[PDB]
Homo-oligomer: A and B are copies of this chain.
């Protein structure tokens, strides 16, 4: 029999921010040591290993609000 589909997700939404000032920031970690000891590493299928990483990060966006759009349609 007949089939009808109407995917109509209308979107008028908004995200907003106001900030009089952003500053006087002091990211001062006291150093750091990372040590990793291992033997054979033997990975085989779709492994996403991270080993021994040390990160210092200072992220100060004026906004920091998020928009990404993914649209997908499949027919058989």
A: which residues have CB within 8 A of B? 1-76
* CB atoms of A13 and B16 under 8 A apart: no
**Copy number of this protein in the oligomer?**
6
Nearest Cβ on chain B to A13's Cβ, whole angstroms: 4
Minimal Cβ-Cβ distance residue in B for A70:
B70
Nearest Cβ on chain B to A14's Cβ, whole angstroms: 5
* CB atoms of B59 and A17 under 8 A apart: no
* CB atoms of B56 and A59 under 8 A apart: no
- The interface residues of chain B lying within 8 Å CB-to-CB of A18 are 17-19, 62-63
- The interface residues of chain B lying within 8 Å CB-to-CB of A61 are 59-65
- The interface residues of chain B lying within 8 Å CB-to-CB of A64 are 17, 61-65
